[PDB]
Structures are given as C-alpha cells and as structure tokens.
C-alpha cells in the first residue's frame, strides 16, 4: 500500500519554536516537501525529490502556499472570534490519498482544532461533518461555495492519484525491499529473577514487518508482548517481541515475502 499526505500547522503566537505556519508533505513515511513561515519558499526534503521536478513546479506551489498561509491566519482569527479561546492555539489540516496494491481508490480531507477532529469531509455527499454547535457555523460558511467543495472532491479523485503515481516512479529507493531484517534472540532480565525471550530484528525496510512466537507448533495466544517499529536513523527500522519463559520455543518473522524461522538455542 502507498500513500500521499499533505499536512498544515497553524500556531497562533510563536515562542522559541518558530514559525506559525508549517506545511510538510509525505510519501508513505518519508518527507518530500518543506514549507515554513520563516522562509516562504517550497523546499525539497528527499534527494530524489530535488531532481525529476522542474523549478517552475517549485515556484508555482510557493505562491499557492503563500496564499494558504494567508488563509490560515484568517481561519485562526475566525476561530478566535467564534470560540471564547484567546492566546496561543493550534489549527491543523490534512489532505491525502491511499492507493492500494490491488488498485483501490481512497481519498480524504480533514481539519483540526487543538489536535481534535474539528471538521471531516465526505466526498460522496459533498458536505462537511460538524463536531458540535460551534463547528456547525463554519460548516454552513464553507457549504455555501459549492464550486470550492467540488474542487476538493475532483482533486482527491483524479489529480491526487496521478500525483502519488508520479512520485512513486520518481523514487526507486521507496519500492526497493533491498534491506532484510537481522533477527537475533537474546535472554533479558529487569529484576531478580525474571526470564524473557526477546526476538530482536533490526536493519529492515519497508517498516512493514510481522513477528510471532510459537510453542512447538502452536501460537502463544494472549501472552506475547510487542514493541514499536522505531526508526534507526540511517533509513532503517527496528522492532522486538518478548515472551515469558517456563521450563520448544520458535520465533517466526515475515518480511520482504520471506518467512524466517528461528529455534531457541
């Protein structure tokens, strides 16, 4: 599964963590586009993103982002006018697509206020979803301009799928599974005395990985504890799975279409 998502941040008043408007785009997990209120220009985030794209594309979306930054300040003042909130708050936006490996189309557009679902868009009905009485007023304000809502629906359907398919071809270092994991079992202890089998796997890409423990020929149901798929820092990922030992235990790994088996030594 492949995805293209564009985020927008809107902080009311800045502190040591400047600026007010930040807009960063993503392709699955890697950043591609960079925009901030300090330097009002669209900057690349990936080495393959800087190439394959003309300077006219970077300049076109810069003026578009400069306009969206001005619109975000208006939406911030309007939110401060409707709500009783005054000071420093956050206004978020998220537009994206999820092109499935089979060919299924899924489009989405969302607006947020202080990390909470403010307004959710429904393309099939061409109307916004209000969270409360305060959200209902902005819902009616945006629902008026029919052609504006139709553009959002049209963009998510044909333009967004075409934009994501163009970026996937531009980035060969995304499609590659040329990074197999290093599954190694280690005996760990926190307090005396405790025993656990840590099936630690590192240096894998894509982040999509499956791990499980099997006692002889049966999976340990409602007992296996799982870690987090964490970024190593060198474009690779790490993950683990632990199980409480008692007086055959086998670790099963699924990555890059390869089923890895590890018996306890």
């Amino acid at each position, epitope marked *: 599964t492949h995805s293209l998502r564009y985020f927008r941040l809107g902080v009311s008043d800045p502190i040591h963590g400047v600026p007010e408007f930040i807009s960063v785009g993503y392709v699955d997990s890697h950043p591609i586009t960079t925009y901030d209120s300090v330097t009002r220009q669209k900057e690349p985030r990936a080495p393959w993103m800087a190439e394959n794209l003309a300077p006219d594309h970077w300049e076109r979306y810069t003026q578009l982002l400069r306009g969206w930054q001005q619109m975000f300040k208006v939406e911030l003042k309007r939110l401060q006018r409707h709500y009783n909130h005054s000071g420093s708050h956050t206004y978020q936006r998220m537009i994206g697509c999820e092109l499935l490996e089979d060919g299924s189309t899924t489009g989405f557009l969302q607006y947020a206020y202080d990390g909470q679902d403010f307004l959710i868009f429904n393309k*099939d009905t061409l109307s916004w979803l209000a969270v409360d009485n305060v959200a209902h007023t902005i819902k009616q304000a945006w629902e008026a301009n029919q052609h504006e809502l139709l553009y959002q629906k049209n963009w998510l359907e044909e333009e967004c799928i075409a934009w994501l398919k163009r970026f996937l071809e531009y980035g060969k270092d995304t499609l590659q599974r040329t990074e197999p994991p290093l599954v190694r079992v280690n005996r760990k202890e926190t307090f005396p005395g405790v025993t656990a089998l840590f099936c630690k796997a590192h240096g894998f890409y894509p982040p999509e990985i*499956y791990m*499980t423990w099997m006692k002889n020929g049966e*999976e340990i149901v*409602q007992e296996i504890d*799982y870690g*987090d798929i964490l970024p190593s820092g060198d474009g690779t990922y790490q*993950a683990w799975a632990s199980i409480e030992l008692d007086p055959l235990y086998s670790c099963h790994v*699924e990555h890059s279409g390869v*089923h890895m088996v590890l018996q306890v030594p």
Partner: T-cell receptor
Amino acid sequence: HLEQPQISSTKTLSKTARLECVVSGITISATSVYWYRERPGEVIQFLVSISYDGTVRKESGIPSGKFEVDRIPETSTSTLTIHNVEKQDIATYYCALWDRYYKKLFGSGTTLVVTD
Amino acid sequence: QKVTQAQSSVSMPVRKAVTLNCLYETSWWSYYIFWYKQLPSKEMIFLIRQGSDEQNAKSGRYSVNFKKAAKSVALTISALQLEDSAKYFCALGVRAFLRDWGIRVLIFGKGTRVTVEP
C-alpha cells in the same frame, strides 16, 4: 465459498464424530482451512488449522490427541474428527478460509448434539 | 488479545440509526478489525474491514468510527431495515504480507443481539 452439508450431528457420549466442510472455486491443496466453535451464550473460539503444505496448528487449551483435520484432494473437502465427545462440546461449529485477499469466509454451521 | 462487547441486546425502530460500541485489547502495531452479521439461520456474513493505519471505513450503509488511542471500533448503520434483525460480531485479525498459512486467527467478541421493531 464454503458450505457444510451436515446441518446437525447427533453423537453418543464419549464417541468419535466427523464434521463435513466442502470448498468451492479454490482448491484445498493451495489454501489453509481454519476451524471455529460457537459455544451457547459465549464467544466464537478457534480450534485447529491445517496449512497448505500439510502441517497442523492448534489453540492454547486443547489436549494432544482430541481433534483431527484432513483435506482429501480427490473430493476437495475438509473434515474435523472429534474424539471422546463430552457435554462441553455442544456448540455450532464453523469452518473458515481466507477470501481474495482481505476478508475471511465462513461455512453454513453444524450444531453438535450429545446424548447419554 | 481479547474483544469485549458490553451491549447484549439492542432494540431500534426502522429507518433510524444504530451505533454498536465495541472495545478491544491487543499489542500488535499493524492489525485489522472485522465486523460480522450472523443470521438466525446460522449464516455468517462479512460487512466491513478496518485497518490500523487506515481511515474510517465506509461500505454503503455500514460505517465504523475508529478510535486508535481509545481502542474503540463503533459501527453505525446509515438506515435501518427489516432484514437487519440478526446477531452482530466484533473480530480482531493480524496484518501479515505472505501466503495465508494457518496462523491468521480471528479473536471474536461476546456478540450483540439486534431486534428491529416496526
């Protein structure tokens, strides 16, 4: 598609009983068959699973030598054999298989009746 | 791995909307949530599927309000019908990327009985 020909199977106390499950479209030799039990007033729980290669798998709380699963390539059907049947086995049994390529199909269901 | 369904029996009239709150306790990073409709004639039917990293699924009349941090998978019906009178099931599955070898086991729930009154 999955279909269980037997609607109910009445078996005598502490005796062997076989439960039918016929596949449609895809062959048993290529896929894996899963088996579930739906206890009255309780949760649908997993029993045994036979892999495409031939290996058998179970669930925590099943003794060694109680359930048997077989898939004949000539007839193309999965059969579950329940040994030493007790009053705790009275439930609607379902057979499962993974659909193309996200959902999981389920059989018609076979309720088991145990008598003295 | 366990799925809890607090609602045992729900009575709702036709044309209205009904929300079935389902709670789950799991540990995997990537997983799936399956909703099933078991007819009184023992007929198990698939309705909708909800992925861990996926946006709120909608399959016609059926729509799931997915809460990741709260671990809630509430299914809402757009418009109620006569044929809706059946037992509803809440299932939990893994997200694997290989052949369906005997390990992809669904963790079901207690169940919710729906009796649609005229």
